[PDB]
Design a protein around this ligand. Structure first.
Ligand SMILES: O=c1cc(CNc2ccccc2F)[nH]c2nc(NCc3ccccc3Cl)nn12
Ligand SMILES: [Zn+2]
Length: 350
């Protein structure tokens, strides 16, 4: 119960203080690469995207970074009616035309020049040992023998969010409509997709990876939630436990393929739906950690059984569509999570 879940969280906290030094090595290499990238005519306006980092909290040495590139006067064209994937289209020509394939922006061309640069600069680094790993649209580096960094390049648009997000980000009941309006004034992002996901096609995918940070840092119905003794909630802790539960289950079954398609996306999306459904800070009281986590678990199970997990920004897109994850995989994860819940989560102890 809550006592055990608390113990897990204190365990993870100790390993977080020991990767401050590893974060320094990452920031060192990242800033070096942003500097050499800015010398390129195509990537001149590249920059770091503020997102908080760690997709894996059971592997404190694996890091995740996003570089953004602003592309002004951008025209988007939705692929099929997939809602999430888009072709990128544009009198005067500019350096980005070297990435055009016909009249659309090629992610392959752009990723290829992106990779060639980093690989060239990685070899030029002599103050630390850093290797590049084999190609999956991101670039992955190994610093020392333990630390690894995934670098994703995203296009940034400061124009209005695409129309498929119009009924999404439904946080009005929790954080108020004016916060939703504010968030929707922030830019949006487009990333290259996998050859795994989708149909090779030069479509880009909507990304809102900058939004989680905005909400997690201002997460209460109360403006002072988690800012004094009398207002301690367990939202952050429940998201951490949900993430750890999926990471642990995927490790336990890494030999089978049955869980390859589940990721922290699904847990996060399910978490923030529970925050929408339970908007009151009193539904997240620190003393009720065990009950609050159980709510998160049972909500996730319900999504699994009904095969419905709406993306948070594009509700028409079902992350748990059988078109994406087959019925048998959800049923399996349901079985494992039900077993965990029923046995006070033995996947959690030492
Ligand atoms: O960066 C993130 C993070 C989350 C995680 N959830 C989440 C984050 C912040 C606040 C609330 C949340 F529930 N979801 C997400 N969806 C998209 N793009 C849309 C999309 C991406 C991929 C496939 C289909 C679709 Cl339609 N980006 N993106
Ligand atoms: Zn709080």
């Amino acid at each position: 119960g809550a006592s055990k879940l608390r113990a897990v969280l204190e365990k993870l906290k100790l390993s977080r203080d020991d990767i401050s030094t590893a974060a320094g090595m990452v920031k060192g290499v990242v800033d070096h690469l942003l500097l050499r990238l800015k010398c390129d005519s195509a990537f001149r306006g590249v920059g770091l995207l503020n997102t908080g980092e760690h997709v894996k909290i059971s592997a404190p040495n694996e890091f995740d970074v996003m570089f953004k590139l602003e592309v002004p006067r951008i025209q988007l064209e939705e692929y099929s009616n997939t809602r999430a994937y888009y072709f990128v289209k544009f009198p005067k020509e500019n350096p980005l035309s070297q990435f055009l394939e016909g009249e659309i922006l090629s992610a392959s061309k752009m990723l290829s020049k992106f990779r060639k640069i980093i690989k060239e600069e990685i070899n030029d680094i002599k103050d630390t040992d850093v290797i590049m790993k084999r190609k999956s649209p991101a670039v992955t580096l190994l610093i020392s023998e333990k630390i690894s960094v995934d670098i994703t390049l995203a296009l940034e648009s400061k124009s209005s969010w695409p129309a498929s997000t119009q009924e999404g980000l439904r946080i009005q009941n929790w954080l108020s409509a004016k916060v939703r309006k504010q968030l929707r004034l922030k830019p949006f992002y487009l990333v290259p997709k996998h050859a795994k996901e989708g149909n090779q096609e030069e479509t880009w995918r909507l990304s809102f990876s900058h939004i989680e940070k905005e909400i997690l840092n201002n997460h209460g119905k109360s403006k002072t939630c988690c800012e004094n003794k009398e207002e301690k909630c367990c939202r952050k802790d429940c998201l951490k436990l949900m993430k750890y539960l999926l990471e642990q289950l995927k490790e336990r079954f890494k030999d089978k393929k049955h869980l390859d398609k589940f990721s922290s996306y699904h847990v996060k999306t399910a978490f923030f739906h529970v925050c929408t459904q339970n908007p009151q800070d009193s539904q997240w009281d620190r003393k009720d950690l065990g009950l609050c986590f159980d709510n998160c678990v049972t909500y996730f199970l319900q999504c699994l059984r009904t095969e419905k997990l709406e993306n948070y920004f594009i509700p028409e897109f079902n992350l748990f569509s059988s078109n994406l994850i087959d019925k048998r995989s959800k049923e399996f994860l349901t079985k494992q999570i039900e077993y965990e819940r029923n046995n006070e989560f033995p996947v959690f102890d030492e």
